[PDB]
Amino acid sequence: NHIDVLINGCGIGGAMLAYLLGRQGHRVVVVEQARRENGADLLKPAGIRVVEAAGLLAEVTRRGGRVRHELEVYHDGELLRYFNYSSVDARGYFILMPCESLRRLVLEKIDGEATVEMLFETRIEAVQRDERHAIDQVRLNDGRVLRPRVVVGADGIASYVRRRLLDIDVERRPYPSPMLVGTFALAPCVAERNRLYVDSQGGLAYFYPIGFDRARLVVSFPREEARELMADTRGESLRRRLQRFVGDESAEAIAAVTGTSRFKGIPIGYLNLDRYWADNVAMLGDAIHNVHPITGQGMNLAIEDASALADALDLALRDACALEDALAGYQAERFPVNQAIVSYGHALATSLEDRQRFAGVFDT
Ligand SMILES: Cc1cc2nc3c(=O)[nH]c(=O)nc-3n(C[C@H](O)[C@H](O)[C@H](O)COP(=O)(O)OP(=O)(O)OC[C@H]3O[C@@H](n4cnc5c(N)ncnc54)[C@H](O)[C@@H]3O)c2cc1C
């Protein structure tokens, strides 16, 4: 019952890590509380590099992923910034791909990896540590006992591994504006170009295509206004509010908002843990950092962490270096990258209303 890595959580980060480790022939058990069976949509160049390394890039666009290289940002109805991400660098492009679509693809690949065992509707019950304080035994709620060299927390914003195995508590810092996302019919303007709108009253509306034939609309307003707008389920108050700061180019996208019933809240946190690991326990993704969803980077960073952790763990598992050195390496690589986006998200979210401050944040 000796295994190389026990991964808690089979979200996008956990799945990507399991697949990358499995491809190397490491013995992996993934534990997921939910049945096999909504999240972020964005892959940035660094995330795309991981996907490309995994041999998955072709399948991504085959399954409705969209390559893009432009963004317009409006403030109070007028164009504030236009970004061409590929103007200097041909590989500057980003990809829009639903988290669930990418995860399903990765799970299909894991299905073919003989050294990976995925356990759904399963959870960690108890752990045992050795005299060196490394976890040496883990019992699952099905009665399964495993002896892993490494335990990984890929278990998201409420990480059991963080809270219970590492006994880390995280202060919460709520924001005054929620963010919500709904899915609608795809208007030609949205198929054309991603457009983000914000206003001096704290409104935000971001329209972008998703999959083959749908569009997302991500919105944010101060809490009580957002409540009012969502309460009018036939959508009239929301369309009217949008019309206040969203210009004609997106008129059809506003018209596509036929109701509010299917809007979903998005989690908003602010975190970058000072330690990404302790003993033989490492964490990735939302377990170690929470970025404001205005950045779009929740999935992307989980994928970037997974790749860096796969590299570090591969080295430790091959005995190319001590686990403690490998994990220290993982933190050194990832922490400044994750930190920069956490800071950026908070700066963006808090500067919305102030046009030049907001523009200032974009430039850096
Ligand atoms: C509706 C919605 C919209 C979102 N949109 C945005 C956005 O616009 N911009 C943005 O930046 N981010 C967004 N996100 C966040 C983004 O989806 C996450 O940051 C991303 O999924 C993080 O990946 P992860 O692998 O670290 O964690 P997760 O994808 O959360 O995966 C964690 C996995 O661990 C499992 N798990 C948890 N606890 C246990 C346990 N005790 N035992 C076993 N398994 C466990 C969970 O079931 C889950 O499968 C959104 C999230 C939601 C819910």
Cβ partners under 8 Å of residue 338, min gap 6: 272, 288, 289, 291, 301, 305
**Residue 300: other Cβ atoms inside 10 A:** 25
Q: Which pair of tokens denotes residue 218?
A: 């991500």
Q: Measuring from atom 3 of ligand 1, which residue has the nearest CA?
A: 39
Which residues is 94 bridged to in the sheet?
68
End-of-domain residue from the set 249, 266, 283: 266
Inter-helix orientation angle 323-351/298-317, to 10°: 170
The resolution of the experimental structure, rounded to one decimal in Å, is 1.8
Q: Residue 220's Cα: distance from chain center in Å?
A: 18
Q: Measuring from atom 26 of ligand 1, which residue has the nearest CA?
A: 285
Which amino acid is present at 225?
Answer: E
CATH number for 79:
3.30.9.10
Which amino acid is present at 22?
Answer: G
- 31 shares a domain with 86: no
- 312 shares a domain with 244: no
Which amino acid is present at 248?
Answer: D
Which atom of ligand 1 is nearest the CA belonging to 161?
41
- 311 shares a domain with 162: yes
Length of the chain as a residue count: 364
Residue-wise DSSP of 16-78: HHHHHHHHTT--EEEEESS-------EE-HHHHHHHHHTT-HHHHHHTT-EEE-EEEEEETTE
Q: How far is CA 311 from CA 44, 135, 138, 285, in A?
A: 20, 21, 24, 16
Cβ partners under 8 Å of residue 153, min gap 6: 8, 9, 159, 160, 161, 162, 165, 166, 281, 282, 283, 284, 287, 288
Per the annotation, binding residues for FAD are 13, 32-33, 40, 286, 293, 298
153 lines ligand 1 (CB under 6 A): no
- Distance of alpha carbon 87 from alpha carbon 133, whole angstroms: 51
Q: Which pair of tokens denotes residue 227?
A: 């409540």
Domain extent for 128:
1-37+98-166+271-364
Cβ partners under 8 Å of residue 129, min gap 6: 135, 136, 279
Q: Is 124 left (phi over 0), alpha (psi -120 to 50) or beta?
A: beta
- 103 shares a domain with 93: no
Q: Measuring from atom 19 of ligand 1, which residue has the nearest CA?
A: 298
Cβ partners under 8 Å of residue 123, min gap 6: 31, 33, 140, 141, 160
- 320 shares a domain with 294: yes
Q: Residue 207's Cα: distance from chain center in Å?
A: 18
* Ligand 1 center–CA 86 separation, angstroms: 29
Inter-helix orientation angle 12-23/99-111, to 10°: 30
Where do runs of H (alpha helix) occur along the chain? 12-23, 45-53, 57-62, 99-111, 160, 188-192, 223-231, 236-243, 251-255, 298-317, 323-351, 355-363
Burial of 198 (0-12, 13-18, 19+ CB in 10 A): buried
CATH number for 285:
3.50.50.60
- Distance of alpha carbon 197 from alpha carbon 199, whole angstroms: 7
- Distance of alpha carbon 95 from alpha carbon 49, whole angstroms: 11
- 194 shares a domain with 151: no
Torsion sign over Cα 259, 261, 265, 266: negative
**Residue 319: other Cβ atoms inside 10 A:** 8
* Ligand 1 center–CA 303 separation, angstroms: 12
Please give the tally of structural domains in the chain.
2
- Distance of alpha carbon 110 from alpha carbon 266, whole angstroms: 28
Q: Measuring from atom 53 of ligand 1, which residue has the nearest CA?
A: 39
Which amino acid is present at 89?
Answer: D
* Ligand 1 center–CA 252 separation, angstroms: 31
Largest CA distance in the chain: 67
> SS3 for 153?
strand
- 341 shares a domain with 303: yes
Do residues 356 and 75 make contact, with C-beta atoms less than 8 angstroms apart?
no
Owner of token pair 């430039």: 363
Which atom of ligand 1 is nearest the CA belonging to 13?
25
Query: What is the rounded (10 degree) CA torsion for 250, 256, 260, 262?
Result: -120
181 lines ligand 1 (CB under 6 A): yes
Do residues 16 and 54 make contact, with C-beta atoms less than 8 angstroms apart?
yes
Per the annotation, binding residues are 13, 32-33, 40, 286, 293, 298
Cβ partners under 8 Å of residue 92, min gap 6: 45, 69, 85, 86
Torsion sign over Cα 52, 55, 61, 65: negative
266 lines ligand 1 (CB under 6 A): yes
For 252-258, the CB contacts below 8 A with 24+ separation are 252/187, 252/188, 252/189, 253/184, 253/187, 253/189, 253/190, 253/207, 253/215, 253/217, 255/187, 256/184, 256/185, 256/186, 256/187, 256/215, 256/217, 257/182, 257/184, 257/217, 258/184
Which atom of ligand 1 is nearest the CA belonging to 345?
11
Q: Residue 94 belongs to what H/E stretch?
A: strand 94-96
For 322-330, the CB contacts below 8 A with 24+ separation are 323/149, 323/150, 323/280, 327/276, 327/277, 327/282, 328/277, 330/276, 330/277, 330/282
Of 6, 7, 12, the one to substitute when testing ligand 1's pocket (max ligand atoms within 8 A of C-beta) is 12
291 lines ligand 1 (CB under 6 A): yes
344 lines ligand 1 (CB under 6 A): no
Q: Measuring from atom 38 of ligand 1, which residue has the nearest CA?
A: 155
Where do runs of H (alpha helix) occur along 91-250? 99-111, 160, 188-192, 223-231, 236-243
- Distance of alpha carbon 237 from alpha carbon 228, whole angstroms: 8
Which atom of ligand 1 is nearest the CA belonging to 285?
26
Do residues 29 and 3 make contact, with C-beta atoms less than 8 angstroms apart?
yes
Q: How far is CA 2 from CA 5, 42, 142, 166, 236, in A?
A: 9, 37, 17, 22, 59
Q: Residue 180's Cα: distance from chain center in Å?
A: 15
- 300 shares a domain with 240: no
End-of-domain residue from the set 266, 293, 323: 266
